[PDB]
């Protein structure tokens, strides 16, 4: 009933209703993200689910309908918010202390002395509780949650773009594949996949030990358009030889997207 508001689907195409059973409440819980506030939603809906026989017979208002019509939407927005809150490690603004920490303080210090922690290991599940109460805590989390958001929308978008293909292969529209699908794929994957592969690669390099300097990714993405062949800090070998190719490939896909299908119409 959510997708049908936006539009009724064409005959025998992919329904937007199956992915929406999971992707609608999981995006909610990235934002909402707390074990306390989520445990409350879970109860508020779990009262509507168990008493549904009693509630359905009795008469209802206009607000109390939608809370009842979506009593299973709210159940999954609560369960997933207890998973995401556990990873963020936030329960009513406070933290849990389940596992050993990958950070270690000095053996000795004094009052008022700014102290820094030293690394030991990696924390298995979630954000380490050493960040809680810390002075520089947002600098870490803001960088973390941005890169989460960019990666989780690229996957949400590409997966929904492979539903175009699944339709064209069911209605036997071959030209639209070569016309629309294959050029548009290369356009964004070559630009916004290259960004997402570089975020995962930078996280997987010990920059300090190796001695090389970590590069900024906002500038790396800008200069490849404005000034190709140029680099200030290198991320991997042959970086410039690959960037200019990806720029070449995107610019080819523009007119190929523009011209290929009308010409087939004229030639019939």
């Amino acid at each position: 009933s959510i997708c049908d508001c936006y539009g009724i689907a064409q005959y025998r195409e992919i329904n937007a209703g199956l992915p929406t059973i999971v992707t609608f409440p999981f995006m909610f819980a990235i934002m909402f993200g707390d074990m306390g506030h989520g445990f409350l939603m879970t109860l508020a809906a779990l009262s509507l689910v168990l008493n549904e026989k009693k509630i359905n017979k009795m008469k209802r208002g206009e607000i109390f309908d939608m809370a009842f019509t979506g009593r299973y939407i709210i159940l999954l927005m609560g369960v997933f918010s207890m998973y995401t809150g556990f990873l963020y490690n936030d329960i009513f603004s406070k933290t849990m202390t389940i596992f050993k920490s990958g950070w270690k303080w000095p053996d000795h210090w004094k009052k008022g002395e700014s102290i820094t922690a030293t690394s030991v290991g990696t924390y298995p599940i979630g954000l380490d509780w050493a960040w809680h109460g810390t002075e520089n805590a947002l600098l870490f989390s803001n960088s973390y949650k941005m890169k989460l958001s960019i990666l989780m929308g690229f996957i949400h978008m590409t997966y929904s773009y492979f539903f175009s293909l699944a339709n064209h292969l069911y209605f036997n529209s071959m030209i639209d594949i070569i016309g629309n699908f294959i050029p548009g794929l290369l356009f964004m994957q070559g630009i916004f996949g290259y960004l997402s592969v570089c975020i995962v690669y930078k996280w997987a390099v010990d920059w300090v030990k190796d001695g090389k300097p970590a590069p900024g990714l906002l500038n790396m993405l800008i200069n490849m358009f404005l000034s190709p062949g140029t680099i200030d800090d290198e991320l991997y070998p042959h970086q410039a030889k690959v960037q200019v190719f990806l720029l070449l490939m995107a610019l080819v896909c523009i007119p190929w997207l523009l011209l290929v299908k009308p010409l087939h119409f004229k030639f019939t």
Binding site: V22, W105, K111, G121, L127, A130, T134, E135, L148, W203
Partner: protein, 71 residues
């Protein structure tokens, strides 16, 4: 032993249960079980792995001037 291989070793275990569940999903409402579970496990993995990789080789370490000397 905590490394980028640790993320792959989970992806093998998770990219196999999706396969076994595809086979074993019941016939009644087969598409809802089959899509919902496979698509749930994946977004549970991607959000673990992102949260793990941001901690292997961090570039800034936590710093404070507020603790008690006793700790």
């Amino acid at each position: 032993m905590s490394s980028f291989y640790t993320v792959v070793g989970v992806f093998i275990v998770v990219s196999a249960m999706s396969v076994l569940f595809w086979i074993m999903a019941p016939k009644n409402n087969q598409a809802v079980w089959r899509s919902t579970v496979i698509l749930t496990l994946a977004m549970m993995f991607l959000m673990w792995a992102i949260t793990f990789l941001c901690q292997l080789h961090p570039l800034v370490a936590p710093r404070r001037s507020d603790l008690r000397p006793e700790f």
